[PDB]
Amino acid sequence: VTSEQLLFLEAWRAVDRAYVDKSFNGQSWFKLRETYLKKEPMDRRAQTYDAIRKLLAVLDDPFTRFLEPSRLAALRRGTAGSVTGVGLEITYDGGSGKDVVVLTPAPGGPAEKAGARAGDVIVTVDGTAVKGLSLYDVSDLLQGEADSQVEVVLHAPGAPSNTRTLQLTRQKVTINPVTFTTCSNVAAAALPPGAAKQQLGYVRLATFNSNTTAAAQQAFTELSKQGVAGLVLDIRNNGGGLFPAGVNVARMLVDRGDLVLIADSQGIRDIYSADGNSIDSATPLVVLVNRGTASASEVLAGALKDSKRGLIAGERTFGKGLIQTVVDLSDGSGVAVTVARYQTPAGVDINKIGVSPDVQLDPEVLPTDLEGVCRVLGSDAAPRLF
Numbered sequence: 001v002t003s004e005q006l007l008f009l010e011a012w013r014a015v016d017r018a019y020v021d022k023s024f025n026g027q028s029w030f031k032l033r034e035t036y037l038k039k040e041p042m043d044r045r046a047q048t049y050d051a052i053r054k055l056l057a058v059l060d061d062p063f064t065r066f067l068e069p070s071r072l073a074a075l076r077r078g079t080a081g082s083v084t085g086v087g088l089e090i091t092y093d094g095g096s097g098k099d100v101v102v103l104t105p106a107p108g109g110p111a112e113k114a115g116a117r118a119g120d121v122i123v124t125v126d127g128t129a130v131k132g133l134s135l136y137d138v139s140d141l142l143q144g145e146a147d148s149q150v151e152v153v154l155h156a157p158g159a160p161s162n163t164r165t166l167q168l169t170r171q172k173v174t175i176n177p178v179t180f181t182t183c184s185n186v187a188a189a190a191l192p193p194g195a196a197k198q199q200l201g202y203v204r205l206a207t208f209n210s211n212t213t214a215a216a217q218q219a220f221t222e223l224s225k226q227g228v229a230g231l232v233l234d235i236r237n238n239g240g241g242l243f244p245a246g247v248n249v250a251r252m253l254v255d256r257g258d259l260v261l262i263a264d265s266q267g268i269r270d271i272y273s274a275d276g277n278s279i280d281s282a283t284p285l286v287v288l289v290n291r292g293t294a295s296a297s298e299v300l301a302g303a304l305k306d307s308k309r310g311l312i313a314g315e316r317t318f319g320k321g322l323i324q325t326v327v328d329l330s331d332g333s334g335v336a337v338t339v340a341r342y343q344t345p346a347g348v349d350i351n352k353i354g355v356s357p358d359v360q361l362d363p364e365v366l367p368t369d370l371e372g373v374c375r376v377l378g379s380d381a382a383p384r385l386f
Contacts, residue, residue, distance in 0.1 A: 004042040007331060009033070011052045011066065014327035014335045015059075022265040025059045032058070049333070061338055062092050063324050065134050069332040075136065079173075085143045086110040086150060086168040089239040090122065090135055091294070094319055094352070098132040102154070103318065104237045104292035106175055107206055107368065110168040111152065118237055118292030118318075119157040126151050136336075144170045175207045178215035181370035182226055187382035192284035195229035200385075201283070202373050204234045205249070208241035208296045213248040220252050220279045230284040232373075232385065233304075236314060236363055240295025247272050247296075250303045252279040253310070258345035259303040262323070269340060274307075285310030286385045289355060290363035294320040295342075301355040302344040313359035313385055321350030359385065 012033045015024075024032075032055065040051040052066045067075065079085055087109015093099035102120040105112035122130050125141040142150060148170045156162040180203045191198060201223035205216060223231060240246065250259045254274040262270035287310045289301050298317045304310040321342040327335045342350040361383050367373055376382060 002042070004045070004048045005037060007329060008036070008040075008042055008048055008051055008055075010329045011335050012036075012055060014329075015056070015064070015337055018325065018327065018337050018339045019059070019064075020264045020322070020338045020340050021059075025061075027058055045331075052335070056335070062096065062098065062134075063322060063336065063338050065136060065336050067136065067326070067334040067336060071136060071140075072326070072328070072332065072334040074140075075326075079143065082145065083143055084146045084170040084172050085139070086152065086170055087112055087173045088116065088122075088142060088152075089294075090138060090142075091318075091320060092135070093121075100130040100133065100135065100138050101157075103294055103320065104239045106173045107237065108175075109173045110171060111166065114166045114168060115164070116152075116154065116166070118290065120154045121157060121160070123153040123155060123163065124151075125153075146171055175209075177205065177207045177209055177212040178219055179204045179206075179370060180219035180223065181374060182223065182228060183232075183374040183377045185378045186229070187378060187380065189384045190377050190382040190386070192230040192286075192386045195284070197227070197229040199226070199228045200377060201226070201228035201231040202234065202370065202377075203231065204368055204370075204373075205297075206238055206368075208238065208243070208245040208249075210242065210245075212242060212245040216245075216249055217252060217279060224280045224283065228283065230286065230386065231280070231310075232286050232288065232377075233310065234288040234366070234368065234373075235293050235297045235301060236288050236290040236368070237292035238294070238297040239292070240297045240299070240320070243296045243299065245296065246300045250300050251275055251277050253281060253285065253304065254278065254307050255281045257307050259307070260299050261343040261345070261347060262340050263343050263349075264340045268343075281309065284386065286359070287312050288314045288363075288366065289317050289357065290315045291318055293317040293355070295350075298350050298355050299342050302342075302348075302350060305355060305358065306345045311358045311386060312355060313383075314357050314361050315363045316356050317354040319350065319352045319354035321352070321354075361385075 087106030091103040
């Protein structure tokens with residue numbers, strides 16, 4: 001057994017051990033390994049990498065992928081320093097044709113500023129067709145040095161002819177996780193039942209990252225204090241991100257019960273429940289979501305809806321419920337494996353299904369800026385949030 005073979009086996013083993021579906025998409029996992037060992041060329045390192053990619057493809061899971069050393073390393077540093085993008089979060093088509101779409105644009109990011117919307121289909125990046133490529137590869141195409149440009153050709157969801165060509169300039173994007181305000185003189189249409197004040201708390205939660213928790217706790221604390229009639233939690237166009245920040249958030253609003261189940265082919269592997277650390281479990285709550293709401297955000301939304309803590313308003317979310325873990329290989333390369341999926345307290349999958357609104361609304365009626373939000377909420381044209 002060669003060194004190349006051994007390496008191959010680490011990749012095979014990583015999946016054999018941790019993959020979400022222990023039936024491997026109906027393939028005999030172990031047999032496969034033996035077949036590949038026999039039939040696949042693994043003379044050179046690059047051939048080993050090809051045999052690994054080939055092996056992974058059999059699972060028909062585009063999130064399960066192989067990463068070469070340089071890519072793995074780069075993935076790690078991410079978009080920290082020198083490495084910039086165009087403010088686009090990408091993922092595969094909800095019905096997946098291996099089409100690469102805009103999961104959600106980063107607020108105030110290049111692409112968002114150039115009119116890009118969650119759900120837009122990316123056709124080419126610098127003329128390169130993206131269909132079917134790894135998201136890891138596509139991102140590489142989108143990132144580059146600050147001040148450099150990139151051409152992105154996109155079309156409207158379900159409108160391949162409705163395209164637009166954008167020449168985006170790469171720049172550091174800084175998404176402020178949380179902003180909040182108090183809306184005064186809220187139209188009666190927008191108030192919860194039995195409100196004794198025409199005042200609503202508005203919390204825009206744009207991203208789940210390391211700063212999310214602290215900012216959110218201060219916001220709910222303040223709003224609770226002011227005694228607003230209802231809370232409006234805006235998670236539209238929020239790709240999710242830091243899972244644990246979503247769990248922290250849910251904990252601030254729910255006192256008791258299950259928030260999220262972690263499942264795979266074997267059953268429930270893990271559970272996150274309310275810990276009695278709420279900040280505000282009583283004020284009427286409405287959560288705004290849209291097709292740009294994904295992952296940890298969907299987790300939050302489903303927890304809030306299922307528990308009956310808040311109403312969901314807007315449009316059905318993305319349905320991005322899978323979880324991947326990167327397993328490092330001896331030579332610095334790595335495998336990204338889908339290990340599990342998120343389910344609501346109700347045992348329903350987030351994946352594919354997403355979170356449905358209790359209250360259907362045009363997801364664009366409400367702005368995201370504090371001034372504008374209140375404006376609309378006090379207007380004659382206020383949405384019937386509750």
